[PDB]
Amino acid sequence: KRVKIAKPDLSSFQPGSIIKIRLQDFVTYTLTEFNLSPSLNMIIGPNGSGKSTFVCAVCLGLAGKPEYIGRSKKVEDFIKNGQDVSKIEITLKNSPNVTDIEYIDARDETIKITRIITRSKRRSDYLINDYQVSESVVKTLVAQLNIQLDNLCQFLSQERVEEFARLKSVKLLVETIRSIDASLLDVLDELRELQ
Amino acid sequence: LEHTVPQQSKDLETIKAKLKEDHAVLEPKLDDIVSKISARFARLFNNVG
């Protein structure tokens, strides 16, 4: 009979994972589809062949901006040369622990985020369930998912790799105190000054 | 100064007790977190030998 692709069932995949990614109108890849394993993802390609561009587009899709990843901002690179719009779509598991969502119920297990980049228009516009929304809603959705772009632990880039290469003990203390609540250290320091 | 001595002597006990209570509340949580991160670091570096 007709060949059928594997069902992208979000229930089987762990919450917060991505099953299928659609990349439309990008450098050397006008239409591409990508699948990610639930346990770990391995991508093999030379640098500058668009694999790094694909990863950067995926990062930009989840409320990501090039200047917020500690790297140079090149919006034009993502856009296909001669195509007006470049589209990146990310599908994620949805659980009833995140607020400020559009067209998606709490019981629904799918949160689809689409980023379109065009040269003519300069604004941050994202799509939830193919409905236009401001970047603030996606950014707060990412913040409520306990995933941070600015923090070096969740996302690591070449500049972040260089920063981590020379790391002082004070930086490790700051990271440890920021991962846990930092109020306790401040209270202990105030008590030490009182002593 | 004899009247001033008890007022200062009363202090350094409540302040130390509050510092000891804060240290006693804070210490086990950081200790377990440090023990867990050290155990994860050792188990990850066991592959490195």
Swiss-Prot record, chain B:
Instruction: List the subcellular locations.
Output: Nucleus; Chromosome
Q: Which residues of the full protein are shown?
A: 900 to 948 of 1093
Q: What is this protein called?
A: Structural maintenance of chromosomes protein 5
Posttranslational mods:
Sumoylated by MMS21.
Membership in a protein family? Belongs to the SMC family. SMC5 subfamily.
Q: Which gene encodes it?
A: SMC5
Whom does it interact with, and what assembly results? Component of the Smc5-Smc6 complex which consists of KRE29, MMS21, NSE1, NSE3, NSE4, NSE5, SMC5 and SMC6.
Regions annotated as coiled coil: 1-27
Look up and give the organism this protein is from.
Saccharomyces cerevisiae (strain ATCC 204508 / S288c)
The protein's job, in short, is:
Acts in a DNA repair pathway for removal of UV-induced DNA damage that is distinct from classical nucleotide excision repair and in repair of ionizing radiation damage. Functions in homologous recombination repair of DNA double strand breaks and in recovery of stalled replication forks.
Miscellaneous comment text of the record:
Present with 892 molecules/cell in log phase SD medium.
